[PDB]
C-alpha cells in the first residue's frame, strides 16, 4: 500500500566538489541514491516529491577528514506490503512448485500448498498454467492474492501470497 | 581509513547510560552456554564446544576465523557466553546495598515499612537524586522494626516483626525477636530467599527506593547467571617455545564451573544439608573472589605458586590499572627519545634532530599537483637515504613497503595518495621533558636535521624545560595530519610561550655565559676596533647593512 512519509538521508561530500553547484550536485546524488531503492524498514521508495526544491541545510565539516556531512530531509512516496493484506497481482512465471507474480517491483511467490487443489498445474498447456474446470491462470493473467508472510533482506523484500481463500484466484 | 568499509553510519558517543544486567539480557546477548570445565577436547587441538575456549566466543589466532561473526582476529571484538548457576549467589560489590534494602522493606510482603502518610517520608520522596532519596528513606525505615497490618484501614502489611540483619563475611543473619525477653533465633538469609522477596517489590516502591525499573532493578544484584567474557578479555600467553599458560580469569572460571557442577550433582543425587552448605559456600567464595580478591577479613584466593589471584577489580585500579594506565595515559607511536645537547647557533624555536631519528620517523603527505615531483623524488630515494620515504598509501588504504619493492623506481604517484616521507627541515614537532609541571614543558619546535645522536636546543629554552646537558633526555612527538600540524604551529609554538600567565612575566631569558659576556661587553671601558666590528656586524642576521658611526 502506498503512503506519504517524511524521510531523511545523510549525505557525505568530498572537498573536491566544494563549488557553486554544490546544492544541485547534492540533489542529483540524493535522487540517484533514493529513487528505486528498497529498504526493509520502509518498503519501496518510488518517487520523491518536489525533487528539485529540497532543502539541504548547512553541512558540517567532519574533524580529521575534511568532508562535509549534510542532513537532507524530504517527502517521498513509499509502498510496503503488510501481513494479511489482499492485493491484485499479475502472474510472471509458472512452475510445478507454484507460480510467481509481480506486484509492482515486488515479486510474490505462492506455493502449491497455498493453492486450491482444483487448479491443477498443466505443463502441456501452451503456455503452461494452473487450470480448473472454470478457471485458467497463466502468464500475464490477472490474479487477486492475499499476502501471508513477508521476508526482509538487506536491500530486498520477499513476499509470500495465498489464493486458497474466497474472493481470490482468477479475476 | 585504516578499517575495512562498513555500511553502518559513523557516529560519536553522546551519552553513557549505566545499569545492571538482567538474567534475560545475559541469556539473550550470549552466543553459547558454557558447561564443560575441560579447556581442551582431547589434548589434540580443536577446543571442546561448550568449554571456556569455545570457537564461537571469538578468535585470537592469525589463521583462524570467528565462528560467530566470520571476521579475522584484527576485526572480531569477541562475543559473550553465559553460565547458569545451580543456586543464586551474592554479588560481592552490592552486599551492603542488599543489606540496606533488606532493612528498608519487609521480608514477608515486599513492601516499605512506611508510607507517604508520614510527612517526613513525603519529604524523603520529594528529593530527585536517587542516592540521597535512598539515604533518607533508609534513615527513616531503619528504625521501624515491625510491618504494620493496619494503617498507623489496611496498607497490605502482613504484620510480622522485622528482623535485625547483620553482616558477617558474605553471609547475612536475620535476628527475629520472636514472641519480656524470649529466645531469639538468627537464621541465614540465603540469596534465593532475598531474590524471591525482591522479585515481589512493586515498580513504584522500587522507584521510591532510588532504583530504576528499566535499568537498575534490586533483584539483579543477585547473580543467577554469570556472563562469560570472550578470550580477548583473558588471552593465553606463551610461557616458553612449547607450553602455553592460561590466564588467571580462565582458571577462576574453571573453578567456578567445577563448583557449579559439584553443587548440581550433590543436589540431584543425595542431599545432606551440611555438605550442601559447604559446597555452596565454596561456590559463593569462588564467584566472589573472581570479581574481588581484596575482600577484607578473609584470606585471598591463591594460585598454585602462592601468588594471589588477579581479580577483575584489581585490573581497574591503581597507576597500572585500566583507567590510569591505558585510558588517561598510554604508550604512543611516532615518538623518539635521546640525550640533549646545547647549540649556540640554533634559533629559539628550532630543534636539532639526528639523521637516524629522521629516517625512522615519518609524516604522511598527500600527493597533490603542488608537490608530486618532490614526492616522487623522495620515493626514488627510498627508505635508506635522506631525504626519502618509507611507504606509499593507496586511496583504498593498501600500503606499499618501499623496503621490499623491487620496482620502487617504477612507482607512479596519483593525486590523493599518501607518501610517508622522512622527517624534513621545518616540520613542527612537539618537544617534552618529564615531569611536565606546566604547559611550557611541552612546546612546538621546528626540525633541523643534523649529524650525531643528540637533540639540540637553544640555551634560552632550557629554563622552561628545567633541563641541563649533564645526561638529561627529552621526548619528541610527530604530528600526523594537517590540522594537527596547524594546531602545533599556531598554538604550542615556542615564540608564543615566552610570557607565562602564572606571573605575567617572561620565562625565557639570556642565561649563562651569554649573560656574563653581555655584562662584560657593555662595560663603559670596552672598546672595539673596526675589523672586529665588521665581523660582529656581519654576525647579526637582522643587520641592515649600514655600519654605525
Amino acid at each position: 500500500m502506498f503512503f506519504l512519509k517524511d524521510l531523511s538521508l545523510i549525505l557525505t561530500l568530498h572537498p573536491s566538489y566544494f563549488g557553486p553547484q554544490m546544492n544541485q550536485y547534492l540533489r542529483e546524488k540524493l535522487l540517484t541514491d533514493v529513487e528505486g531503492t528498497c529498504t526493509g524498514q520502509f518498503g519501496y521508495i518510488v518517487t520523491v516529491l518536489d525533487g528539485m526544491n529540497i532543502d539541504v541545510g548547512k553541512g558540517r565539516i567532519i574533524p580529521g577528514s575534511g568532508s562535509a556531512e549534510f542532513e537532507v530531509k524530504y517527502r517521498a512516496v513509499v509502498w510496503k506490503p503488510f501481513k494479511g493484506e489482499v492485493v491484485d497481482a499479475i502472474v510472471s512465471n509458472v512452475s510445478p512448485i507454484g507460480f510467481f507474480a509481480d506486484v509492482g517491483p515486488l515479486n510474490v511467490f505462492v506455493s502449491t500448498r497455498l493453492i486450491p487443489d482444483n487448479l491443477v498445474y498443466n505443463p502441456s498447456n501452451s503456455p503452461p498454467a494452473y487450470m480448473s474446470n472454470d478457471e485458467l491462470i497463466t502468464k500475464g493473467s490477472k490474479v487477486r492474492l492475499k499476502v501471508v508472510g513477508t521476508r526482509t533482506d538487506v536491500n530486498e523484500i520477499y513476499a509470500i501470497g495465498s489464493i486458497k481463500e474466497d474472493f481470490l484466484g482468477a479475476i | 581509513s585504516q578499517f575495512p568499509y562498513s555500511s553502518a553510519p559513523l557516529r560519536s558517543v553522546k551519552e553513557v547510560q549505566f545499569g545492571l544486567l538482567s538474567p534475560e539480557e545475559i541469556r539473550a546477548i550470549s552466543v553459547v552456554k558454557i558447561e564443560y570445565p575441560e579447556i581442551m577436547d582431547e589434548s589434540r587441538q580443536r577446543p571442546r564446544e561448550g568449554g571456556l575456549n569455545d570457537p564461537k566466543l571469538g578468535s585470537i589466532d592469525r589463521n583462524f576465523k570467528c565462528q560467530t561473526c566470520g571476521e579475522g582476529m584484527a576485526e572480531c571484538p569477541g562475543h559473550f557466553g553465559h553460565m547458569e548457576l545451580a543456586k543464586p549467589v551474592f554479588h560481592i560489590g552490592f552486599i551492603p546495598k542488599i543489606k540496606k534494602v533488606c532493612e528498608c522493606i519487609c521480608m514477608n510482603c515486599g513492601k516499605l515499612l512506611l508510607d507517604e502518610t508520614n510527612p517526613t517520608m513525603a519529604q524523603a520522596i520529594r528529593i530527585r537524586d536517587p542516592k540521597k532519596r535512598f539515604n533518607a528513606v533508609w534513615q527513616l525505615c531503619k528504625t521501624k522494626m515491625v510491618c504494620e497490618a493496619d494503617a498507623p484501614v489496611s496498607r497490605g502489611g502482613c504484620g510480622n516483626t522485622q528482623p535485625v540483619v547483620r553482616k558477617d563475611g558474605m553471609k547475612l543473619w536475620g535476628t527475629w525477636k520472636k514472641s519480656r525477653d524470649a529466645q531469639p533465633e538468627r537464621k541465614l538469609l540465603t540469596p534465593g530467599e532475598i531474590l524471591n522477596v525482591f522479585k515481589h517489590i512493586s515498580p513504584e516502591d522500587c522507584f521510591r527506593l532510588g532504583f530504576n525499573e528499566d535499568y537498575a532493578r534490586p533483584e539483579w544484584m543477585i547473580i543467577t547467571v554469570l556472563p562469560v567474557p570472550p578470550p580477548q578479555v583473558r588471552p593465553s600467553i606463551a610461557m616458553d617455545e612449547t607450553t602455553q599458560g592460561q590466564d588467571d580469569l580462565t582458571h577462576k572460571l574453571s573453578d567456578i564451573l567445577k563448583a557449579n557442577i559439584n553443587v548440581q550433582k550433590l543436589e540431584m543425587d543425595g542431599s545432606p544439608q551440611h555438605i550442601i552448605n559447604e559446597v555452596e559456600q565454596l561456590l559463593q567464595f569462588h564467584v566472589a573472589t573472581y570479581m574481588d580478591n581484596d575482600i577484607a577479613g578473609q584470606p585471598q584466593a591463591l594460585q598454585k605458586s602462592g601468588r594471589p589471584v588477579k581479580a577483575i577489580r584489581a585490573r581497574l585500579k591503581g597507576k597500572e590499572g585500566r583507567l590510569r594506565g591505558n585510558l588517561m595515559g598510554k604508550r604512543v607511536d611516532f615518538s623518539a627519545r635521546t640525550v640533549i645537547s646545547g647549540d649556540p647557533n640554533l634559533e629559539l624555536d628550532q630543534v636539532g634532530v639526528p639523521i637516524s631519528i629522521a629516517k625512522t620517523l615519518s609524516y604522511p603527505e598527500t600527493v597533490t599537483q603542488y608537490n608530486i615531483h618532490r614526492l616522487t623524488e623522495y620515493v626514488r630515494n627510498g627508505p635508506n637515504e635522506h631525504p626519502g620515504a618509507k611507504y606509499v598509501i593507496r586511496d583504498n588504504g593498501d600500503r606499499i613497503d618501499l623496503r621490499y619493492h623491487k620496482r620502487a623506481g617504477d612507482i607512479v604517484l596519483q593525486y590523493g595518495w599518501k607518501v610517508e616521507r622522512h622527517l624534513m627541515d621545518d616540520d613542527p614537532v612537539l618537544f617534552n621533558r618529564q615531569p611536565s609541571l606546566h604547559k611550557m614543558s611541552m612546546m612546538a619546535h621546528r626540525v633541523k636535521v643534523m649529524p650525531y645522536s643528540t637533540f639540540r636546543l637553544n640555551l634560552s629554552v632550557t629554563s622552561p624545560y628545567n633541563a641541563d646537558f649533564d645526561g638529561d633526555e627529552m621526548n619528541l612527538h610527530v604530528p600526523q595530519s594537517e590540522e594537527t600540524r596547524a594546531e602545533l604551529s599556531q598554538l604550542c609554538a615556542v615564540p608564543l610561550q615566552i610570557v607565562s600567565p602564572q606571573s605575567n612575566k617572561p620565562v625565557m631569558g639570556i642565561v649563562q655565559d651569554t649573560l656574563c659576556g653581555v655584562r662584560k661587553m657593555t662595560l663603559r671601558d670596552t672598546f672595539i676596533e673596526y675589523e672586529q666590528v665588521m665581523n660582529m656586524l656581519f654576525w647579526v642576521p637582522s643587520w641592515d647593512g649600514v655600519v654605525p658611526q
Partner: protein, 93 residues
C-alpha cells in the same frame, strides 16, 4: 604519553592533537553498537554486509564507533561484572 602531558595539552587547548595522540598513534578500534540497547552485542559480518543485535532483534538501527581498544576492554570487563554500560549516539534531555 602520561596524565601530566595530557593536562599540558589541555592547557594548550589543542584538542585535535590530543585526540590524534590517544587514538591514531595508539589503539584505534572500530566497534558496532545497537541503536536500542546501546550494547556492543552486534554481530557484524562486513563482507556479507549483515548486521544484527539478536537480543533487541533488530537489523537496521546499528551504528559504528571509533573508540580506543582499552575502552572496549574496559566495557567488556564491566559487562563481566554484571554492569551494563550503554553507549548512545543521541541525547535525551
Amino acid at each position: 604519553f602520561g596524565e601530566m602531558e595530557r593536562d599540558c595539552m589541555i592547557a594548550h587547548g589543542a584538542a585535535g592533537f590530543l585526540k590524534e595522540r590517544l587514538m591514531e598513534a595508539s589503539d584505534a578500534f572500530r566497534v558496532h553498537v545497537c541503536g536500542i540497547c546501546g550494547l556492543m552485542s552486534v554481530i557484524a559480518n562486513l563482507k556479507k554486509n549483515q548486521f544484527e543485535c539478536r537480543s533487541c532483534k533488530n537489523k537496521t538501527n546499528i551504528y559504528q564507533l571509533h573508540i580506543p581498544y582499552a575502552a572496549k576492554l574496559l566495557f567488556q570487563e564491566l559487562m563481566a561484572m554484571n554492569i551494563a554500560p550503554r553507549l548512545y549516539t543521541e541525547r535525551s534531555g
